[PDB]
C-alpha cells in the first residue's frame, strides 16, 4: 500500500520563462502566505506540493468553519464546547480538511494566470478496500455511503446514495414488470398504472430522504453559503436581510425575464436534434424495410454513422447557445450556474435518448403510412448516388411491430453493455496506451481528468425515463436496469479510483437539477405510457376520444396518486426535520433556563384566593379615594350564599 | 357610549335546585380559585360575572404565555427583558387578555355540567367607530385589520384580511370580464385562460401572504399548540420528539385508513343532493318549457319549494354521517376536528351551489334531448295529480340557451341581494321581535348567537367558485361580486357588532380548510371553463376530440401557469420568512458573542509563515527522535530557488 504525505498539488504550465517565471514567483509568494510548499518539477511542468504546516492554526480555522456553518443554520448542532481541542470528539474528516484547505488556496488568495489544475491525491489503501468491500457485498449499507462522504464529499456521496436508493426501488418494477411480461403481455393498461404509482412513490420518497441526508451530513442549505461567482454582474449593493453583511444585488425578476429565452431555446433543440434523428430513422426504414439491393449489411451501418457525426455537431452548436444563454441569466454562485447549464443540456439529452422511440411508438407503428413521402425522398436520392440510371430494387413498405421490441432491447441490454466498455474499458485502455515513487505516481494522477458527477447522474436519470415512459412496451426493462445498477455501483466506484483523479470535496444538500428532470419524466411518462398502450395495441384507432381518454384517465390517476402519496408521507415522521426542530427548541430552552433559573416551561392554592380578595380590597380602597361600576360582594362564600338564596327565591315565583 | 367593567360572563341554567345548586356551588368554588366573581341573576338564569383581580399575578401569566409561544417557535421575538413590567412596551392586547383568561376559565379548571355559555361583552364605543371608519373609507388599510385582531382575534382578523385581499384581486377579473362582455362576447376561449391565470396568481399570492400575517401577528404554527380534545382516543403514551413532554399517541396511518371513508361519503353527497337538484330542475323545465296550462305562475314556485324542503332534509342526514365519520377519524385538537368537518360539508356546499349550473351547461344546453325521458315522467305524474282524465296541454320541448344567462344573473345579482337581507335584515328583525343598564344590555347580548367565521368564509369561497368555473358564460360576474364584496366588508362588520355576541379570541395562522377548497375550485374551473366554452358555443359538437382537446390544453395551461407563478413568487422576498430566519441567526450569533468575546463570524502576516517553519521544525525533531516520507526543504525562498533552478535545467534538455 503506497502512502501519501501531501494535501494538495499545484502544477504550473511552463511556456515562456517571462510569464512562467512570474507565475512561479507570486503563486509561491501567495501560497507561503498560509501554507507550506515543496516544489519538485516533472514532465516539463513544475509541481507545487502544498500542505498545512501548523496543525494548531489549522484546527483554529476548522473550528471557525464549524461555527460558520452552524451560525447560518447549515449545521444542526453547535461545537459550543468552545475549546477546539476537545471539539475533536467530532474529529476532522478528510473531506472536511481537504475542502477547507482547498478554499484557502482557492478563496480570494488565488484564481493564477492559467494554473494547470489543483487537485488532492488519491488514497490507494482506501480505494483497494473500497472496491473490495463492495464487490463482496450483495447489499450496500448507509455507513458505506457515509465513508464515501468522509473521503470524497457529499457531492460524490449523494450520487451513490441516490443510485443505491434508486437501485432498491427498482426492484418493484422488476417484480410486476416480470409478472406483466410473464402473464399479462405487452402494452398492458395495468403495468402503466403500476409504473406511474411506482414513479410517484420513489420520487416523493427520495425527496424526503434528501432532507434527512442533508441533516445527517450537516449540509442542509449549503447551496446559499458557497462563494459567489467572480463574473457575477451586480447593479447595486445592499445588506443581507438575514446576516446584515454587504451583499451585491441583481434584480431577480430581471433574471426571470432573461430565463424566458429557454422556451425558444428548448424548441430549437427539439427541432434541430429531432430533425437529425427522424432523418436517420427514415434511412433506417428505407435501407432495411425497403430493400435497396446488395451491400444492405454494409449500407445498414451508414445511417448509424450519420448519428455519430451528427449528434455532437448539431448539439455542439446548440450547447454554445446554451453556454451563452447561461451567462446572460447571470447566476450569483457557481452552484446555481452549473445547475442551470445542466437543465439546458437535459433538453438535448432528452432528444438523443427518446426521439427514436417516439418516432416508433407514435409515428411508425400506430400509423406508418405517413412515412411514404419520407421513403420516396430516399428512393430518388439513392438513385442519384448509384450513378447507374436503373432504379434501385424496391419492395412494399410493410410495418413491423417488432421494431419497438428491438429498440427497447438495445437501450436496456446492448446499450448498457457497450456502456460498461465505454465508461470503464476505454479509459483503462487509455492508461495502457500511456504505458521518486511519489513523483511517478503523481505524474500519472496529474494526467487524469477530474471526476464529473453529472455524467453518472444523467446515465441513471435518462435510464429512469425509459422505465417511466417506454417500459410499458417492454416490461422486462426494469430487470435489465436492476442488474446493471448493481454493477453500476461497483463500476462507477472503480472508475473514480483508477480512471479519474480524486475530485475536490464539494457539498450539496440535494441531487439538484435532476429532481425536476425526474419529476418531468415521471409526469410525461404517465401520458406516454397510456398513449403508447392505446396506439400500439393494434378496431380502428379512433384518435379522437380513444387516445385522449386514455391520457385523461392515466394522467389524472398520476395527479391523484401524487396527492395521495404526499399526504401519506406528510404524516410519517421525518428524522432530519425532527433534529433541526428539536435543537431550535432546546437552544431556546437553554436561554430560558439561564435567564430564569431553570424554572419555566404550579397552580395556586385556594387560600391564595384570599390574596385575590386582598387585591380586590386594594382596588376598592383606591376607588374609595375618589358609580355602579365598582360593585363586588367579596369572598368565596358570600357570593355562593347570595346565589344560593337566589335559587329558592326564583322557584318561589314559579 | 356605554362602558363595561367585566371581562367574562358565565350564565348557569336553572332547571331543578338539586343540580342547579350543585352547579352554582362548585362552579363558584372553582372560579374563585383564581378569579373574582360577582353573581347577579336575570331572566331565570344566574349570571356569573368574572374578571381578573390581581393585575400583578395576571401580567405574570401573560408574560409566561409570551415565553410559551416563543419557546415553541410561534412567536418571532422573545420578551427576554425578563422583567414583566418593562415588557409592556409591547402592551397587553385586549384579545390577548380575553383569550388568556378564557383559558383560565375554560382550561382544565372548568368544562361544568351544562353551563349555558361563556362569552366576553362587546365594546359599543369601539363598534361605533368601527362601522363608521369603514363606511367612510373607500379602501381599507392593514392597520384596520390589525385593530380587528386586537379587539377580536386572528380567527376573525384573517377573514377580513382574506376578504379584503380577495376584494382587490377581484378587480382584475372585473376588468377583462367587462372587456370580454363589451367586445369578445359570451363563451370566449380567452377569458377562460385569463380566468385560470388570475385564479393561480391570487391563490398563490394569498398563501404567501398568510405566512407574513402569521409572522406579523406572531401566530405562526399556533395550530399545534392549542389544547387537545377531551374525547380524543389514544392507544399509548410517549415523549414529544421535540419538547420531550408526555404526549398521548394515536397511530397517524390508522387515521389515514379511517379517512378513506370520505371517498364513498363524498359520492353519497353528490348522488343524494344531485338527484334532488336534478329532479327539481326537471320540474322547472317541465313547468316552464312544457307549458302545463293555467296556474303556471302558481305552479312555477312549486319546484323551488321542493328545494327549500329538500336541501336541509337530505343534507341534514348526510351531515349526521359526516359528524359520525368525523369522530371516527379521531382528531387530537379542536382545530383539526372542526377543520375536517368543514371539508366534509364542502361537498354538500359544492352540490347545492353549482349542480344547477352543471345541469345547464353540460346536460341542458349542449344536448337537452336526453331530458325527454325526464320530461315524460312529469307528464304522466302531473296527469295523476290533476284528477281529470284529460291530458295536460303540452308543447314542444325547445332548448333556450338564455337559461345559463338567467341563472348566472341570479347567483351574481339576485342571490346576493337576498343575501344582504338574510344575513343582516333578518337577524335585525329578530331583535325587533324581541323588543340596571348593565343588566338590560347584558340580557340583550346573552340572547345572540356566537359569531361563526366559517359561514362568512364559505360565502366568499363558494362565490369564488362561480368566477373560477362558470364566469366564462357570464363575464360580468366578477363586477357584481366586486360591488358585493365592498359592501360585504361593511355588512359583515356590522353583523358582528349588533347581530351577534363578541366571539372568544381564537388564533390561527391560515384560513385553514378553505385553502384546499379554493385550490380545488381553481383547478376544476380550468376544466369547467373550457368545456363550457366548447359545448355552449353552438358544426356538430364532436365530443370525442373537440371537447377533450379543449380540456387538455386549458388544464395543462393551468398546470404550467401554476409552475410559472410559483417560480416567480419563489424568487420574490418574503417578509415573514425573513424575520424568522434573521432572529434565528442573531440568536445563534448572540451566544457566540457571549461565549467567544464578540470576536467571530484576520489573515496572518507573511512573517507568521516563519512560525509555520517552526512547526515544521518541531515535526522533524519529533521524527528525528525515531524514510522518504518526511522530506522538506524548509523556508519560502529555498523552495523558490530550487524550483527556479529546475526551470533552466528543464530547458537545457530541450
Ligand atoms: Ca454503465
Ligand atoms: Ca455511471
Ligand atoms: Ca352577504
Ligand atoms: Ca359574509
Short mmCIF file of C-alpha atoms in Angstrom, two decimals, chain A residues 31-36 53-54 56-57 60-61, chain B residues 602-616 635-636:
data_model
loop_
_atom_site.label_atom_id
_atom_site.label_comp_id
_atom_site.label_asym_id
_atom_site.label_seq_id
_atom_site.Cartn_x
_atom_site.Cartn_y
_atom_site.Cartn_z
CA UNK A 31 0.94 30.06 -1.13
CA UNK A 32 3.55 30.58 1.60
CA UNK A 33 1.19 33.25 2.91
CA UNK A 34 -0.50 30.48 4.86
CA UNK A 35 0.72 27.10 3.57
CA UNK A 36 3.96 25.17 3.06
CA UNK A 53 2.15 23.15 8.46
CA UNK A 54 0.74 24.39 11.77
CA UNK A 56 -2.77 24.44 15.78
CA UNK A 57 -3.58 27.25 13.36
CA UNK A 60 -8.40 27.02 14.74
CA UNK A 61 -9.82 27.55 11.25
CA UNK B 602 -7.83 38.44 10.25
CA UNK B 603 -5.42 36.70 7.87
CA UNK B 604 -1.92 36.03 9.26
CA UNK B 605 1.06 38.07 8.09
CA UNK B 606 3.73 36.51 5.88
CA UNK B 607 6.16 36.63 8.82
CA UNK B 608 3.91 34.15 10.64
CA UNK B 609 4.94 31.66 7.92
CA UNK B 610 8.18 31.54 9.94
CA UNK B 611 6.07 30.11 12.78
CA UNK B 612 4.93 27.74 10.04
CA UNK B 613 8.61 26.91 9.52
CA UNK B 614 8.85 26.48 13.30
CA UNK B 615 6.05 23.90 13.39
CA UNK B 616 7.71 22.02 10.54
CA UNK B 635 11.55 28.11 4.10
CA UNK B 636 9.85 30.24 1.47
#
